[PDB]
Design a protein around this ligand. Structure first.
Ligand SMILES: Nc1ncnc2c1ncn2[C@@H]1O[C@H](COP(=O)(O)OP(=O)(O)OP(=O)(O)O)[C@@H](O)[C@H]1O
Lengths: 366, 147, 366, 149
């Protein structure tokens, strides 16, 4: 493994583990390894979470992006799924999301994705680590014409908001929803997507604070979303994460509905509509034994691989299926998204509940 | 409708944006459907006046992104994405915003308000046809033909 | 020049002579210097010219200064005099501008606009030199609490425009002018400013594309704006510098109006009207020796300060005088703005032409 | 007057805070016992619902709506071409332009409780119903706007 980049990229404590100077080195090194195989000046996009230290590392990476000639038409508030969808529909060469996801605000996490739609492969991170760990300095510096100029893609987030609404393939009206961004990135897309869908709006922790991302609200503390959904009479409750990597569900009974129940519900709904797979949906071994037992009773074929979302993505790409999700909440619904997409997973679940009519109380039967 | 105030206000706002080089690409609908493409963006449903139009189309501002689509004697749009064109004769010197204004010439049935953000030249492509770089009196005649 | 400071900040070529990492270092250690001399969180400003490679240095310094604690609100694409006026007006504790003026596109400026309102004080430069000279970077690196978010100040064009309309001192309407933007500081606010006097506007080079700054238009070869004055038939000229500080113009006949000639015209319009209450105005010996003869014939006493506006402003602060500068056209009305401002000089010349009765064909003949 | 306007109060507070960090000094209204319409009949009003983008782009300076103040009724602000009547006293602090003094005048004459962002005084202060407060916390502004919205 790389010394800083690892499984989910590089995740270290801000101004402690990975220096911002090392980030201004890393963006340029990633550019000098990004322009290796494309033609012309390749393009990329960038997004980040709502953390206060998230803006510093993202600004440092954008500063390093103008060192090797990486033109950026980026934003600053989107999910990792948003950057993945923008990379897939934009034909660019790279995409990076700056967020530490479920951890506290004391660390930030920078990871570069793969332009095909999945994460970046082993060769990209290996060459970037080779460039960073090299003692000398060989990165070219474009002074004359050839250096790019940064641009704001603030209108570009509307594409990520519409594509999820397009991938919904049905209005989310009727089912009175209570969304839970919880100081994440869903204050930019989920509120607009639900309001356009004639749904109900009641968001807890929807205002970013800078040091409140994934702090006492969200995927690592789902108490407040369930409490507010029960108190406001929500017929359905959904919650997101800081980087929106995972997804958690708030039931009408005030209990906790987890990713295993979410995967069982999505698998049954796709079995009804005949779009699960050939016969086999991927599965992480960290799911509950009752979940896999109910899956085996349901009859859909289950495959277990190495623990980790990267292994889940590799199994999805190798096994030719169209679904994969671990019980934490990262659900690769590749029939409508390029990579892990909590918002698309919630949209598919709400459409499943609308089309099938199965109750929010009984949705966790399997 | 006898829009002797509405068209005059839109013309005054367009000339004010053109001389001072305010960059935008606005529109007012016609006798066909224009609400489905307009519902996407932010909503104001603002009362129509030239000064408020100059305010909304001010550069580097909060509502400075996206088109301005108007219905009736008022305006209701903010940053709603219009359908782009597919005709081959698109001018490269015409902007991508001007390309979007050319988008409506075959998927809508109206005109637009196109102001170049690079040179300030006038542009319009309506009812399939077009009219570009018209003077203030000439664009006034264009709007009188629109009425 | 100190340990790492130039003449008016940091002057050099981006990613060729200066280093972008050194720019982030001069942001961070400079933020430490600014923090070690003022109680409370220091609030600063940032600005940059429209140079092609310019945005990389400004982004790197904005990222570097973002760590030290002083939350540097940034306002890109604005004049240096506009940035100084905004810093001294809104209540800033510091500021930054980036412009190289007469230099070609191969280099970009870096200027730390001090908290006084004039150019940066000696103590600030010495402290920044000390904190970039020592080996260890012992600044307090805040992890989450104390980090400074980057609040964009895109309304910075509006305030700098508002300083022009107050300095109009009456309408400049009716007259016909020519304003060559020169793809520089005039590309953002000066066109709207000269339009804001409601006169006939004929612009040259107002469509900057980054690499067109100070190329075949402006204060490097003023024959083009004069040819445009002859063809367009406007009355007076205006050709801004790189940072909207210097000023020069061509008449309705097409000749060259000197900076000392513009100084003599503004001085005659002042000493006639009694506005220059310190009537012995300052002067530079960098102009022609006959300019002082013209001043002595005009009945206005003149002193001699060294070449450049630094000692000129120093003598202006010493003996409490209002007008005095070099031959480049910095008609620095210290009772109307902060420092050298080509837009303010053009406004003063338009006021002189409006109130003096005689047009510009007779003012320069003194 | 609905829950949409109740959330629009929070949106207007967010816009005023983003103006306070950027010194976009302007004055707004919320009627509190009599109509501002007699003073709000000066210009071309809008009556568009109070949205964050519309106000945040309208109340910027050096533009077609910089002068005057914002006047409101219901869930909407009637554009910006009409300010309230200014003050008449001079025993209070003279440390502001037209904005804080004129809003305190609206407190003195009208029954208003007007939010008026300060450029001449930097922060945000509230003059309300014949009284005032200066440079209060963000939570204070949010609570006051929710209570008297
Ligand atoms: N489909 C669309 N709907 C609405 N607005 C659009 C659309 N496409 C582009 N725009 C607007 O136009 C902008 C991009 O157009 P662009 O600036 O390239 O063109 P232009 O201003 O006509 O030309 P130039 O850039 O040469 O001045 C976007 O930021 C947006 O505001």
């Amino acid at each position: 493994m790389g010394k800083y980049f690892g499984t989910d990229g590089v995740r270290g404590e801000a101004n402690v583990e990975l220096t911002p100077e090392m980030a201004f080195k890393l963006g340029r090194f990633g550019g000098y390894v990004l322009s290796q195989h494309e033609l012309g000046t390749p393009k990329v996009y960038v997004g980040r979470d709502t953390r206060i230290s998230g803006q510093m590392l993202a600004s440092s990476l954008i500063s390093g992006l103008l060192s090797v000639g990486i033109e950026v038409y980026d934003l600053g508030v989107i999910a990792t799924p948003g950057v993945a969808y923008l990379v897939k529909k934009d034909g660019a060469s790279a995409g990076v999301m700056i967020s530490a996801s479920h951890n506290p605000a004391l660390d930030n996490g920078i990871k570069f994705f793969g332009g095909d739609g999945y994460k970046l492969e082993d060769e990209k991170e290996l060459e970037i680590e080779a460039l960073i760990d090299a003692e000398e300095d060989t990165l070219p510096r474009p002074s004359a014409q050839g250096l790019g100029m940064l641009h704001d893609y603030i209108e570009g987030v509307r594409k990520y908001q519409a594509f999820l609404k397009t991938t919904a393939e049905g209005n989310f009206e009727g089912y009175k929803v209570v969304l839970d961004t919880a100081n994440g990135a869903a204050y930019t897309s989920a509120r607009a997507v639900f309001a356009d869908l004639e749904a109900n709006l009641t968001v807890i922790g929807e205002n970013p604070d800078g040091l409140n991302i994934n702090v006492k609200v969200g995927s690592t503390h789902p108490e407040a979303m369930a409490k507010k959904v029960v108190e406001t009479g929500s017929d359905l409750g959904l919650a997101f994460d800081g980087d929106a990597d995972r997804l958690i569900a708030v039931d009408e009974n005030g209990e906790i509905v987890d990713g295993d129940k979410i995967m069982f519900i999505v698998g049954k709904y796709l079995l009804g509509q005949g779009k699960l797979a050939q016969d086999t949906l991927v599965t992480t071994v960290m799911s509950n034994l009752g979940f896999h037992l109910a899956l085996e009773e349901a009859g859909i074929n289950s495959v277990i691989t190495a623990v980790g979302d990267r292994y889940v993505v590799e199994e999805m790409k190798k096994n030719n299926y169209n679904f994969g999700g671990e019980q934490s909440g990262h659900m690769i619904f590749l029939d409508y998204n390029t990579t892990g997409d909590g918002q698309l997973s919630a949209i598919q679940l709400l459409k499943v509940m609308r089309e099938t009519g199965k109750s929010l109380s009984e949705l966790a039967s399997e | 409708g006898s829009l002797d105030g509405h068209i005059s206000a839109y013309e005054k706002s367009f000339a004010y944006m053109s001389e001072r080089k305010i960059g935008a690409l606005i529109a007012i609908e016609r006798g066909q459907n224009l609400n489905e493409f307009v519902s996407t963006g932010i909503r104001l449903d603002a009362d129509i006046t030239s000064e408020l139009l100059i305010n909304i189309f001010i550069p580097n501002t909060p509502l400075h992104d996206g088109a301005v689509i108007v219905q009736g004697n008022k305006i209701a749009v903010t940053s709603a994405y219009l359908p782009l064109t597919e005709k081959s004769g698109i001018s490269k010197q015409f902007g991508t915003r001007h390309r979007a204004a050319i988008g409506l010439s075959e998927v809508s049935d109206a005109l637009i308000l196109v102001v170049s953000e690079e040179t300030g030249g006038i542009s319009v492509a309506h009812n399939g046809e077009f009219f570009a770089d018209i003077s203030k009196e000439k664009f006034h005649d264009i709007l009188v033909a629109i009425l």
